[PDB]
């Protein structure tokens, strides 16, 4: 369980922290990170939720990020990744890929 998530993080620099239900639907807390660097190397992290009510909702998690963190993220990721989005679940890997590449800038 925990070791499985550890494996996916090593392999893909993404982590599903938690899944939970609310009146709106079924949701997952996600973080994606820059690929491993050195001690002096940059490390960026994007947090977002994925929701299911086939379409998936992408909701970026930004409110507790510092001004400097958000500025840096907005310099690397395209502007639409800071908005709530709805798209086919079959397209989700495209957004994983785009976020992963963007964070490596």
């Amino acid at each position: 369980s925990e070791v499985i998530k550890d494996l996916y993080e090593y392999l893909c620099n993404v982590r599903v922290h938690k899944s939970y239900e609310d009146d709106s639907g079924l949701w997952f807390d996600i973080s994606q990170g820059t690929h491993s660097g050195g001690s002096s190397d940059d490390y960026s992290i994007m947090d977002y939720k994925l929701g299911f009510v086939t379409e998936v909702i992408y909701a970026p998690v930004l409110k507790q990020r510092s001004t400097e963190e958000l500025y840096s993220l907005q310099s690397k990721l395209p502007e639409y990744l800071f908005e709530t989005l709805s798209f086919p679940l079959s397209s989700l890997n495209q957004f994983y890929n785009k976020i992963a590449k963007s964070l490596n800038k």
Binding site: E9, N13, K18, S31, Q32, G33, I45, K49
Partner: peptide
């Protein structure tokens, strides 16, 4: 070292609000 696993430890209420 799993940076994302420990990320939530630096901001524990990140996803709460």
């Amino acid at each position: 070292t799993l940076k994302l696993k420990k990320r939530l430890e630096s901001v524990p209420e990140l996803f709460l609000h």
